[PDB]
Amino acid sequence: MQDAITAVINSSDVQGKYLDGSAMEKLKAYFQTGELRVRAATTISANAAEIVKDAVAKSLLYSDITRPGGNMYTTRRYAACIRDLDYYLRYSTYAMLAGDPSILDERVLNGLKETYNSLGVPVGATVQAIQAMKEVTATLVGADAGKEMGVYFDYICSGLS
Amino acid sequence: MQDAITAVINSSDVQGKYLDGSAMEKLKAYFQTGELRVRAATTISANAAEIVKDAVAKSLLYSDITRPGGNMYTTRRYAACIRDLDYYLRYSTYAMLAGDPSILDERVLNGLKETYNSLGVPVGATVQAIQAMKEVTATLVGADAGKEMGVYFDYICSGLS
Amino acid sequence: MQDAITAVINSSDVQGKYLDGSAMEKLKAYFQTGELRVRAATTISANAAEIVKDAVAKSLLYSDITRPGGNMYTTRRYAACIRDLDYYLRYSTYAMLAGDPSILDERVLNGLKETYNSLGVPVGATVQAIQAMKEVTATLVGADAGKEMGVYFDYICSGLS
Amino acid sequence: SIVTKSIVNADAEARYLSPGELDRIKGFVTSGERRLRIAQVLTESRERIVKQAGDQLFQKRPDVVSPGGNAYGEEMTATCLRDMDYYLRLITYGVVAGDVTPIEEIGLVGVREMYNSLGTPIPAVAEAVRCMKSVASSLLSGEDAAEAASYFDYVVGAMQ
Amino acid sequence: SIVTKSIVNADAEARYLSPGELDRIKGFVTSGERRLRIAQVLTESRERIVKQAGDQLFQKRPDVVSPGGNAYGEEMTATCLRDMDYYLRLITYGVVAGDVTPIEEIGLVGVREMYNSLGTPIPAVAEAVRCMKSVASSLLSGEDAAEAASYFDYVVGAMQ
Amino acid sequence: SIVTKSIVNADAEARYLSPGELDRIKGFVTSGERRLRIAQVLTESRERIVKQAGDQLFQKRPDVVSPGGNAYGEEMTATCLRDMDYYLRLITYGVVAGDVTPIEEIGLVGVREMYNSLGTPIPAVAEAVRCMKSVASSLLSGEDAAEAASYFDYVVGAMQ
Ligand SMILES: *[C@H](C)[C@H]1/C(=C/c2[nH]c(/C=C3N=C(/C=C4\NC(=O)C(CC)=C4C)C(C)=C\3CCC(=O)O)c(CCC(=O)O)c2C)NC(=O)[C@@H]1C
Ligand SMILES: *[C@H](C)[C@H]1/C(=C/c2[nH]c(/C=C3N=C(/C=C4\NC(=O)C(CC)=C4C)C(C)=C\3CCC(=O)O)c(CCC(=O)O)c2C)NC(=O)[C@@H]1C
Ligand SMILES: *[C@H](C)[C@H]1/C(=C/c2[nH]c(/C=C3N=C(/C=C4\NC(=O)C(CC)=C4C)C(C)=C\3CCC(=O)O)c(CCC(=O)O)c2C)NC(=O)[C@@H]1C
Ligand SMILES: *[C@H](C)[C@H]1/C(=C/c2[nH]c(/C=C3N=C(/C=C4\NC(=O)C(CC)=C4C)C(C)=C\3CCC(=O)O)c(CCC(=O)O)c2C)NC(=O)[C@@H]1C
Ligand SMILES: *[C@H](C)[C@H]1/C(=C/c2[nH]c(/C=C3N=C(/C=C4\NC(=O)C(CC)=C4C)C(C)=C\3CCC(=O)O)c(CCC(=O)O)c2C)NC(=O)[C@@H]1C
Ligand SMILES: *[C@H](C)[C@H]1/C(=C/c2[nH]c(/C=C3N=C(/C=C4\NC(=O)C(CC)=C4C)C(C)=C\3CCC(=O)O)c(CCC(=O)O)c2C)NC(=O)[C@@H]1C
């Protein structure tokens, strides 16, 4: 994976260049966002269970999904599903700290879409849940952090389609 | 895998229903066939070597298959082939006891057709052998059990094409 | 893998035939080339580092390949590349001793082309290097051995396209 | 079912079933009639079993149906009873199959993660099963009640 | 061949062949002429070797050619001799290659499963090879007979 | 960066970052300004650092620039200096990132195999880095020189 710093490095390395004004300015941008990123990560860590609890209630419960014949039916599949949500939240949080989505491509999205098709996991429904988690998270961490977290929730969704 | 009982359960579970008249009747059907299934399995276990021996003599020997250039040529390939036949007989016997073919899909047929193509295993010839084993088995276990065993021998053949 | 001897055997075995005049003559051909093969293998073993060193200087260095953005850029990729060359040289040498290329198909070329595409390894450039190594080797081991080594260098190249 | 389980064992040892496995299956299909009757009673009286057990449950655990409780109000109480009906259903599955496996695979694997998430008090759910066990047992012979007991108990002891 | 075997060794250790391996191959191709001559004799006299060995075999083991035996009757006796010819052939393969590997890969791997299935008495097959060894050896020098002995013996000791 | 490294750790333990990891990152972005300034100085004076270090290097190691040496002649000397500039560049990468990882991944992994192949004397390359360290350090405060020292030293101690 990359974070915002090492990404800039590889961009300058690929060109065999020292860090110029633009590169230095991007690094500065990132450092200045540093503390807000940590603070938001602390908040999300602290409510991780409830964020997923709210996101599930809001988008999945009392539907066909959770009834006999739905993909969330049987306790094993219910657990699997909210386990996926913990994943998406935790890696979204990583990506947010890092200020770069490469960890999502690397450890979350790789062959995920194909897996979901294979088992019958409803992608559209999954995405509704993530988008719900985005709103719940935003409410919790504020507008600025919520926007940034949103970048990565969205990144995940796009990878699923 | 499923057996005849757990298959019925999943059918009723998928619908979120208790066991109704049809479901109960299928379970009854299965229990009533129970002892005949065990008896036939005891007989097949007891002659497993000779069933394959007869099936091979009847359908494969003294042909191009067993001569230099055939797929049964070299002792390693001869052993491989009759080893496949022991497999088909033993799992057919499982499926018969279970009154359900899901074990064939699960542990026998998965990627089998592709494997056989890959190594040059003659599928048509393989199927002749299995169909021969069916006749040999039928002779041995009687008409009713032979019919049932036949269900699974056939199931395997269909999976090979 | 096969060597020149076991290849002839399998050809006669496939036909269920004893070794006839042609088969015996091929075996003889091989034995008579035996010592020249060992001698050339001793020479190549003895200069293996310099052969690759020369082949690299001749075909890859001071180009875009070794500059920032090239596939040989970063010391890890430079090492990887000349490591590939050691491989091609060592297996070419095996194939030469064996008087048969089956080891190249078996342990070198299997899924290689697909791998190279996957990582971005330049195939054309790789082949230039191997063809350079051929010339360097030829210079070193003489015309006859060089021709034979050439058979296998070429075999590798063809497998890459 | 012992039929699946035996087959799985035999397969992992690359062999036909053992004479004992075969005999085991023989005694299993023999008892098929009896277990079907037990499931049938529980099926037929499901509405009573779940209603009465629910009433007993809410006596033992008024907290869950009082404000602040996971089953507070008509809709949440109804969902609770809905869940109880789920487990009575699964238990009838287990009874015909001869073991607790369909209960496990449908209703216990990850049950902790599900109910934790929802904030449902899991010990109160265990208690609800006890209550159903109590009501169910009375509609059965001493023999059948004993046999059915092991299915209810397993659910209760696995509600963790 | 020692050539393949050396290469396989060297490859597993990510290295060129050792001076000893190389020297080994050198002595191997040097003896190529001699081993070819030995295979050539066995090739040329194959029909005699298999016929006489078959006759000796059926003296030592009349059970296999009497009623109830695996080689009873003209056709089964002919198939038996057919098999013997198979193994004489494989042995000539081994001789030119310098080791028993082509014998193993073509005719010994799973030979037990094949012959058990057919109900062919495997010790009688071993005996048949002994018989071919006996006949073959007489057509060779003391030197060549000794060298060829190891191939026949290996087949006999691996007939299990 | 400690940010990547922390994340990788946390991920391998299936957890969010620890309060300490988080605090570590907080102190890391806090020192961002300082490390950027250090990289900026080395960037700005790169041509001097590499030229003077090259001159000092060729004093300590005249063999590399005399006949028979790996950097003999204008073009080879220029390639040597080219390489030195490479490593100064990588070092500025490491400085902003807070650790030696970009140096490792770009310029040390397999560096031995590369330079051995080329016949470049690796200890003389280490010395060249020492020389750049010397020149670079003088353009920095005692504080910044100390901090930058660890990056140069790591390269030198990893030049094996
Ligand atoms: C929940 C919102 C939705 C849902 C989920 C669901 N997923 C599965 C199965 C899998 N999910 C994953 C996904 C990941 N695994 C990982 O390790 C990571 C990153 C660390 C991700 C993103 C995988 C690999 C599987 C298969 C393996 C497994 O079981 O864990 C299921 C169960 C499928 C089954 O039938 O077994 C479910 C139910 N389903 C929904 O209905 C929601 C919309
Ligand atoms: C015999 C009637 C025919 C025949 C068979 C043959 N098969 C192989 C190779 C394989 N067969 C299998 C099949 C299975 N493996 C399993 O584990 C199971 C279920 C438990 C099945 C159904 C597989 C996986 C292989 C490849 C791996 C292996 O060698 O075991 C061969 C040998 C192929 C080779 O060249 O090595 C042969 C000869 N061939 C015939 O001619 C008959 C018609
Ligand atoms: C060098 C002339 C060219 C070049 C090579 C290059 N290759 C890789 C990566 C791999 N190369 C191989 C090839 C083999 N591996 C084997 O084990 C064998 C036989 C024993 C062969 C032929 C493989 C498998 C890889 C991937 C795994 C690995 O890294 O070793 C790279 C690095 C790719 C990367 O980005 O990591 C390079 C640079 N590249 C060139 O530019 C030359 C033309
Ligand atoms: C009743 C004794 C206790 C209780 C129950 C309760 N449950 C819920 C919500 C749900 N329960 C389930 C249950 C299952 N899903 C399955 O697949 C299986 C296995 C067959 C079971 C048992 C599910 C999926 C839900 C979510 C709602 C839905 O159907 O989508 C509630 C409501 C919780 C809420 O806040 O909505 C309640 C009240 N609660 C208690 O306190 C009793 C101890
Ligand atoms: C003779 C000394 C003994 C004997 C032999 C016997 N064999 C068979 C039948 C077969 N034998 C083979 C043998 C091989 N197949 C191979 O690929 C190899 C390696 C090269 C060998 C050695 C095969 C394939 C058969 C089946 C027939 C066929 O060719 O398809 C028989 C006939 C058995 C029958 O009942 O038909 C006999 C008699 N039997 C003895 O008793 C002697 C000790
Ligand atoms: C200078 C202090 C020493 C020295 C250097 C020297 N190097 C070369 C040739 C090359 N050096 C590289 C270096 C790198 N490639 C990378 O990707 C990285 C990491 C960023 C490094 C450091 C490469 C690729 C070459 C090959 C030439 C090319 O660019 O393609 C030479 C020339 C060798 C020759 O014979 O051509 C020299 C002289 N030599 C010394 O003696 C000094 C001690």
Author numbering:
A (entry chain B), B (entry chain B), C (entry chain B): 1 to 161
D (entry chain A), E (entry chain A), F (entry chain A): 2 to 161
Mind quoting what the paper says about this structure?
Phycobiliproteins (PBPs) and linker proteins (LPs) are mutually arranged in cyanobacteria and red algae to form multi-molecular assemblies of around 4–8 MDa called phycobilisomes (PBS). The core invariantly contains allophycocyanin (APC, absorption λmax ~653 nm) and associated LPs. The heterodimer (αβ monomer) of two homologous α- and β- subunits of PE, PC and APC proteins is the building block of PBS. The unique red-shifted absorbances of APC chromophores and their fluorescence emission overlapping to that of chlorophyll has been found to play major connecting role in this light funneling phenomenon.
A09DM (formerly known as Lyngbya sp. A09DM). The APC crystal belonged to space group H 32, with unit-cell parameters a = b = 101.2 Å, c = 193.0 Å. Although only one αβ monomer is in the asymmetric unit, a trimer of the Phormidium protein exists in the crystal structure. The trimer in the crystals is generated by the crystallographic symmetry. The protein is observed to exist as a trimer both in solution and in crystals. One PCB chromophore is covalently bonded to the conserved Cys-81 of α-subunit (α-chromophore) and other chromophore is covalently linked to conserved Cys-81 of β-subunit. The β-subunit contributes three Tyr, three Thr and one Leu residues to the microenvironment of the α-chromophore. However, microenvironment of the PCB chromophore bound to α-subunit is enriched by hydrophobic residues, owing to the presence of Met-85 and Ala-129 residues, in the Phormidium APC protein.
